[PDB]
Amino acid sequence: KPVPWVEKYRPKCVDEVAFQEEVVAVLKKSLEGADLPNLLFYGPPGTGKTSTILAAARELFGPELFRLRVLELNASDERGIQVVREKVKNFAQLTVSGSRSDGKPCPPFKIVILDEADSMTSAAQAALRRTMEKESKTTRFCLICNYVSRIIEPLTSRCSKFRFKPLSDKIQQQRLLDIAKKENVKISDEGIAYLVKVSEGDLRKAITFLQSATRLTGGKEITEKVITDIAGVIPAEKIDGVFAACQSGSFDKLEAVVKDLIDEGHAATQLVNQLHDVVVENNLSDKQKSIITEKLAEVDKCLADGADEHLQLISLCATVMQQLSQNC
């Protein structure tokens, strides 16, 4: 019966979105002639690409027909590209009659919301290109992607490209306060600042985290601890303990610190991320930063391959300890 807040609290129509000016202008000029070309929305995640084009489809099509004539597909299908090829083929093959009671005849095309478009191989993008040129007039496509430079030449040369510059912290805090006051959850504003700091400009993750904290706490106060446990962020005293153990130069306390972090359930990838964020913004020498960041990259690769968190973390901490003790 209910629906999570991240899709149900989106902008309903165009120009209800925030911090985009040129994008809304050319989109409105597209809605004015009821002629939406092929679209390529690129930007950081949670910037509001999907909300914007869903609002555009709600402007263009009737709400009883807007769900019927759009189709949200994902490009990271592991079964190949022919699956999404035949899916869009038989989605555009059907021609179900629809009309609007407001006095405007609906445009004949359909909308495919194809997200993660930058995760496609060049051959998969070529197959998508041949599918788009096959369905040139019956459906006009959009591609949501993270980076515009991953999309190959023939697709990127024909869809209009829009960059979604990331929202600032202040507008995100204003929006999150709006969600908190409208959803009746009592959370202090420094907690909301912690939310926008933790999510790192991902407003969708911030909304999901706020909903999870609301439905996990039970209507009580959302402290920073609940947010920290929900987001999986390792607290900074553990990072400081890791760095102090590395700076001590003793292996046994380093092993004790790594074991204490492992048995607390904290993820190794999050620890690698936070160590990298600490290291790249310190007063370390350039060679120390280079060696530590290279080791962090190989440790991240090894952790993605399924290697043990304890062994990878103790090898990384041994490298950091050697780098921090070779100068002292």
């Binding site: 609940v226 999986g232 993820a267 993605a304 399924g306 043990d308 968190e309």
Partner: protein
């Protein structure tokens, strides 16, 4: 029915530690639209019992009965694979990591049948059936992509519970839509509390010194602590403060393997160490556990500058072990490189 499952708590109010988290999970259940859960933490922390408590809070007492069924799924490469399954009327429990690279052959299909049952079974209690995913950290990349598309497709149909030890291998797409429940290992005092409570309920009394020794030897594993306490109960009818806690057999075997590695560095000793590692591998001990135990028992005899190199070598060959298929090569390669480095260290 040992002490580990005879006294397993059945509801969220009977948990002894992580009581704030237990209250938070109760408040999660009472909202009526709890999301996919990603429960993680070390082994023996108490993830499975908390998931069982959540399931007993969600549905009635009927989740406490379980039944084993075998499912035979046809692979798209046309080779049928049969897997076991623990289930109830309201929930399913599966471990698709047993299917190798055909784990997606479970994932895209098995939950689909549950979804079929969600339009076949009607109970008017809740609009979903919980699918428990054990060792989801052992899935592959395409298996996790299949899981992502599966929870997108049957969101309103069934709910997902993913139990793992490490969220390092799981993809950020699979974490971006699941509520993360981190269950840390209990402290020493908490294990002592659980051991005293379990001994009192059985009618025995154990001293605080013996309970503290058991909790320290368990390495913050509650299940290992309970099993060692049961073994101590078997060994002696009364619990004395100086009663010897018996040791794990494969652990002491790994310790003599490390002693044999350290003692002599010869090709003959290398072959006997290879035979010992093969003997451990035939006992279904995981090779990552063997590597961790070997590193833990080899760092005692090492010197301070050698420790970092030995740890980095062990991590390197364990990553190779993850990448490869025949783990004895990477195990003995680490072993032989360690004997070479140790011999070079001892000559100087």
């Amino acid at each position: 029915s040992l002490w580990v499952d005879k006294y397993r708590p059945c509801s969220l109010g009977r948990l002894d530690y992580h009581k704030e988290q237990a209250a938070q999970l109760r408040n999660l259940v009472q909202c009526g639209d709890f999301p996919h859960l990603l429960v993680y933490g070390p082994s023996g922390a108490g993830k499975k019992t908390r998931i069982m408590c959540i399931l007993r809070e969600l549905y009635g007492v009927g989740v406490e009965k379980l039944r084993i069924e075998h499912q035979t799924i046809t692979t798209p490469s046309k080779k049928k694979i049969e897997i076991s399954t623990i289930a109830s009327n309201y929930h399913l429990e599966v471990n698709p990591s047993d299917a190798g690279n055909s784990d997606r052959v479970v994932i895209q299909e098995m939950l689909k049948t549950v979804a079929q049952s969600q339009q076949l079974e009607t109970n008017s209690q809740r609009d979903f059936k919980v699918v428990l995913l054990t060792e989801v950290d052992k899935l592959t990349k395409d298996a996790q992509h299949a899981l992502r598309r599966t929870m997108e497709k049957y969101m309103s149909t069934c709910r997902l519970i993913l139990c793992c030890n490490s969220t390092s291998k799981v993809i950020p797409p699979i974490r971006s839509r699941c509520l993360a429940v981190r269950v840390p290992a209990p402290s020493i005092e908490d294990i002592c509390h659980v051991l005293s409570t379990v001994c009192k309920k059985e009618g025995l009394n154990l001293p605080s010194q013996l309970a503290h020794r058991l909790a320290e030897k368990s390495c913050r594993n509650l299940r290992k602590a309970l099993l060692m306490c049961e073994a101590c109960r078997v060994q002696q009818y009364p619990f004395t403060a100086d009663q010897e806690i018996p040791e794990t057999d494969w652990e002491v075997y790994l310790r003599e393997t490390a002693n044999a590695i350290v003692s002599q560095q010869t090709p003959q000793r290398l072959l006997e160490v290879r035979g010992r590692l093969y003997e451990l591998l035939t006992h279904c001990i995981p090779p990552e556990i063997i590597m961790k135990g070997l590193l833990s028992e080899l760092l005692h005899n090492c010197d301070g500058q050698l420790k970092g190199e030995v740890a980095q070598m062990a991590a390197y060959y364990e990553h190779r072990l993850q990448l490869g298929s025949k783990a004895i090569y990477h195990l003995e390669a680490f072993v032989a490189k360690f004997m070479a480095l140790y011999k070079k260290f001892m000559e100087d």
